[PDB]
Design a binder for this molecule. Sequence first.
Ligand SMILES: [Mg+2]
Ligand SMILES: [Mg+2]
Ligand SMILES: [Zn+2]
Ligand SMILES: [Zn+2]
Lengths: 490, 117, 73, 275, 46, 49, 51, 404, 67, 49
Amino acid sequence: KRHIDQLKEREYNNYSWQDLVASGVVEYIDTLEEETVMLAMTPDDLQEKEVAYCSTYTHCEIHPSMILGVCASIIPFPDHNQSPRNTYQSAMGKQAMGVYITNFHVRMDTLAHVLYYPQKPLVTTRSMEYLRFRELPAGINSIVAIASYTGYNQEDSVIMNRSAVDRGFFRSVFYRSYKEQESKKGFDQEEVFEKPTRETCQGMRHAIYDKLDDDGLIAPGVRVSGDDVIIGKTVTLPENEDELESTNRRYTKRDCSTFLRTSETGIVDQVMVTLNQEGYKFCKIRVRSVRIPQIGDKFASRHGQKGTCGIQYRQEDMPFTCEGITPDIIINPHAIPSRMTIGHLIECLQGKVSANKGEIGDATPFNDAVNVQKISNLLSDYGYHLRGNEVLYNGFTGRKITSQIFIGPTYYQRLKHMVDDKIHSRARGPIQILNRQPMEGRSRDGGLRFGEMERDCQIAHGAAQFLRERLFEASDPYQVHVCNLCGIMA
Amino acid sequence: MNAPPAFESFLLFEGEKKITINKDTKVPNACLFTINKEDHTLGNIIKSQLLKDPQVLFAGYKVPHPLEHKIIIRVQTTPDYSPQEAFTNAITDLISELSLLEERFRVAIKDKQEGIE
Amino acid sequence: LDALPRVTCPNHPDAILVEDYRAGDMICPECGLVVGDRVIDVGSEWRTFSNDKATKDPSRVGDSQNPLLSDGD
Amino acid sequence: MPYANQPTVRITELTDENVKFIIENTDLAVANSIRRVFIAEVPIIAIDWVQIDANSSVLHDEFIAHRLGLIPLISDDIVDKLQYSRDCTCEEFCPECSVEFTLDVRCNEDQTRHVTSRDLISNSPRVIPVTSRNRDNDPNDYVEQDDILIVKLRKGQELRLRAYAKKGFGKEHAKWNPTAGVAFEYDPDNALRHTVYPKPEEWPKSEYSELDEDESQAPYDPNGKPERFYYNVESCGSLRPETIVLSALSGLKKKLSDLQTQLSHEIQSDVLTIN
Amino acid sequence: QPMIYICGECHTENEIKSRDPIRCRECGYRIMYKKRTKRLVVFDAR
Amino acid sequence: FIGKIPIMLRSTYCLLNGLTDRDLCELNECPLDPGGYFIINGSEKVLIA
Amino acid sequence: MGKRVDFSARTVITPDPNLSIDQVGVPRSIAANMTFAEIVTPFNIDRLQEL
Amino acid sequence: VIFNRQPTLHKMSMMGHRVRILPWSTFRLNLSVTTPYNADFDGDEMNLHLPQSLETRAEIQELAMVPRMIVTPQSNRPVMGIVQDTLTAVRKFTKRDVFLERGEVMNLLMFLSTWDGKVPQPAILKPRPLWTGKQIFSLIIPGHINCIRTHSTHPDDEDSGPYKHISPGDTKVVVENGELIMGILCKKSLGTSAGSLVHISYLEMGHDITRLFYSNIQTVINNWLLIEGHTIGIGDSIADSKTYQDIQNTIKKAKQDVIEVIEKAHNNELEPTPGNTLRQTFENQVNRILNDARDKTGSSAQKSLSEYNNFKSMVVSGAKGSKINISQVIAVVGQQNVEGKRIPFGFKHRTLPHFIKDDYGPESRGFVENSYLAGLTPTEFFFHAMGGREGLIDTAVKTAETGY
Amino acid sequence: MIIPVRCFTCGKIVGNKWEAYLGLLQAEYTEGDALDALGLKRYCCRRMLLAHVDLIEKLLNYAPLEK
Amino acid sequence: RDGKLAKPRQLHNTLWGMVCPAETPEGHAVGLVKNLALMAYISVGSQPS
RNA sequence: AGUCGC
Ligand SMILES: [Mg+2]
Ligand SMILES: [Mg+2]
Ligand SMILES: [Zn+2]
Ligand SMILES: [Zn+2]
């Protein structure tokens, strides 16, 4: 413990972890060497020992919960969860949004999602302190009920308190940066940033060139949308090689300006003009968009329960309790038992006691705290049902619900993947020229593939006209003349 | 985006009407009232005032789909008494109870209290 | 039909021909009749890499080799 | 009519912050719907149009607009004098259907400035300001009453905008919640058995369960019905609690009377052919 | 006339409403953030 | 001079390696950014073990 | 044997109990963008003329 | 339109639906078709195709349309039956103790579809009007659909008890003339089981009226659910002092008995079973002891569950998860294992450096004593992750091979 | 970021209690008691103030409040 | 990559406090892409001389 | 390409 008193002293002294290694009280052990050591789990066990197990130990663990990697440490009580459940959380936690570094207002990152009101979790693991996760939170403490309420929330969806999303719950800002270069590029062809005009250029998609500034690129604060052309680049090209005037009009230069095909709405945040590594006049322009949590956006607790927001109700229709503290999320009770994610349930009860006591809660996995009964006991001292439930009234008809609903805080994450980006439809789009069949991605506004496997299914349906429609008349229909005397098309 | 403007939740549409009445043919003497742009706040109360009435055989309401502001009320009465009159009376009766509640409340506030305004 | 400096509106001589890229059609501003054989810039079209791999480019059925320096690659 | 169940009220306790009371001899649906009215249907005044002249703050524009949209407005003065944007004949906004605010601030000092609703000002006469000492030369002072904190600023940052508040109600957006909280409770001894306690001893008795001050816990009564509803309306301060209840009762009467008139209009205008 | 361009750090206007190089005068930076429109844009509080 | 080698961010050869919280906030770099990754043509490029 | 098709749509799915088993609820944007080719008859002509 | 999903494992994965226009941006689906698509709403995308002619619209309407994809020829039983939350609410609802006042019945009647319009007489007239649960259910069951048996939950007896004279017990499901006579409904009646109620509606009265019957049942039961509720909380995960002592004491008996088998093996007193080696015999014997321990203790935990418990109601209804999940949550997680056998000696003759060399005792090699509620000790935790990984990897590898 | 005006769950105004709160922690460290003196009884309003991180103070230190 | 079941995918015994037990992708690359433990460190190399 | 979604 005298070494500990020097470590407390470090607050105003040069003593450090290196000094600690210099006392020779800690050692570094690689995996090959770790095979030959006799390693006690915890000081406690190495102490009690007499004839309990053995006495030949040579090393001891500085703390057993250290076996976890960076993302696994966010997840509280990971040992009360079924093991693969922890693995899904490690993926999803990495997937959530929030604030990702503080100086983000001047970074031109290609794509970012920033949350409005991130909160540090009420329940935490001690490791989370070393992640500065108190500085850059990824989500919000919801008041949650595990109920069935309206059946909207079956099969991993969730009912949400719409007034809570209105009072600003889980709102986000979204940023996309579009970037463009003025290459000198060709032999005599040349690029210029400038406002195009239908009098003297080739191209002129029906989209509106009128929002462009006289500089050739839009300006901050102007509202943009799905067809707006944000930067006006032009390419003087033909030059004059087609003899004569070649003037009529629109003959001097082709259009290739850069326009919205990914951020189908927003505001211009910033427009930034500089010159890049090549020395060309170069541009980056950022658009901020705001995503309200809506039916289809995807969320998760920290114990690998992702689910979609299945509907949203007014704060009037949510079920309510005593004071009328109506829950922001209701996650369906059928979700817990088959996945056995019991740790999520401890977090409500730990969460209820921390918030209520006012002290932030410990949920570091391996301790002697016997943490289930004792958390329950604290909660009863505060005055709730000692094991968490509450009597919630039916929000519609004001009636009391026959049984009780389990409710309390839990950190929740709004994940990157949000409905408004995925939605897609095609009704005769562009056609690729190697196949004269429809495009592939949404980046080229494409159709979907009616795969080998989907085909096989229609045979089993015996709907041949529809199979014939889809693999032919709906995508790529063509007429050919063939000679009769010889089967060759020519 | 596809989300309605939030005011469209309660303003009547210019080509719509507030209530609509259609007969049911499955059983004699019965009616179906359509209340547009209304919710459980209204629907649930009218159900309870009608069930209070002893001439009413059946009364119930159902909101056909949550995303869709509209409620339907089925009411059925004895042949000797039109179901429409029970509904009109049930509202007026309800209007009377709330009016008496408002008068008693203001008077109760008027009771020796201070800082009432 | 060899006469088409983008001109092909049967009822009245063309004024301009606008490209409705997303619907994949060529439209004539003062009437309404399409004249399609849609190709919203064949250079955008080869970009049929997405979910498929891309920065080794299996879809690379066509190198560019920067010809505008030489006499011809 | 010869079956209408009177409804008697009783105020337990009242403050400028909350109003707590018990209703008796009424139906649960009445007790319920009235509750849904306190939340949704009491109209109020809140910012609805924000136009921003300048924003050099360390915050994006919509974010300033949002937080500002939630700032509480003293509608103690009858919102009834002031109309809705749609019914009011004028083009866009006007003095009779809207209230005008201006905020103009900049941080010139070498000290971090806080921007707070007191800096937002009513062009409108002082009958509809922000909830910050406009009426409180309160002897019960809390050495602050800063009302709210719109943003924070450092030297050289500026924020200039104008905003037009409107009457609207809670059914359209949460900013128009008149309530801070709205407690509702009935049958606190669970006599009616509307909820069923497994191991009924684990539950704590409520503040009204005292009637069985005895530990006997929840006596059954099978012939019972719901009676005696307990309320606790708490105001965010944008409107006096007593006034919230009274306006709610009126709004619900106006709403019902309108449905009756519409229904009357069903047989009066274009006579019904149900018979 | 895009004759604004707030600077990299000196924040002085740039007055480069033409083809000349975007070097801020007095101030060495050549990163030029672009000034807001005089245009009015409304945000509903919702 | 023989060539230019990329610097790993916030290593002792970065400019960031000695600076306190105040200088880094001044330079416009977040004090909480872990560093340790290259910047190549404006892209953050991290090597994988 | 499997090619991309036109008149096709994709979104995230969410549950709706108030829905019949063989109904599917579909977003306005997809309904307005998708089309069906009706043929005009001498009687529904008036309704199509309205559309 | 026909909507579908990938991968299209079988014909029921792609079916015709009628569009119904709604606000917001996602496809809404009637919860009950979730299973034949094998979707969730945990974030799954679906794709829709709109046919373009009257011939193809006719061909879909007549051939592929969902009320016609109900009983699959894949194994002549229904493809879809009542699922999830509704299924637990139907169990809870048909119990013989459920009673409804005139108001609640009128409200449920109002949500039904084919309702003739005649409120049935309540099973209790006096002292006050009361309708029983089964009774209201009988309005939903079509014209005269009639099953039998299909009681076979863990309620009543593994068969000889009911013959002890038809002390109705309360679990047989008898219906006649399309009217539910007695007994709780569940996975065995409503599920996709060959002998089920949904099977009899389709087979008896035709496809369409069955289609309206799925719609009709899900809607009525979900409203009742709204007043009833359903939840889960730590309250469901807790037994008592007596169960918990007996659980520990039974694990203590098993562990001591293993040490006896190790001592018999080290003493070389043991002999091999015919057809096997001594290690295989030792391993067969310790495995028989730790599983038998696990099952005895699980069966103890099943015995202790009160009837009010939310957790027991989901397993017994047959909504989600199984009896074994309750064991793991309440009593003991049990043995961990890779490729079938106990955790291999990844180190030199050890499993973790925390143990001593050669420790076949149940803890150093696999078997976790604690429950998910008590938490897993550090070593127990890591060995569990080894067992969970097998499950993650197998999903990916199996998916590719079946695909081919 | 900054403190959200009006607690998400129930609706009670709350931004007004932030500045008063930091003064309490300098005084009476009993976070429960400090929350209590501000009048945030019910725990949703309490988590609101209790869990928030005031990120704006770090953000203010970047030299340009003008971009 | 893409068609090969194997034992270098399954968490190995030696990964105790060396590489995170449960932080590897859920896709086809499962278990092949691992994530370093929190206390784990990696030797930088030195002359044996 | 890789990342990633189910
Ligand atoms: Mg799911
Ligand atoms: Mg999913
Ligand atoms: Zn004017
Ligand atoms: Zn058997």
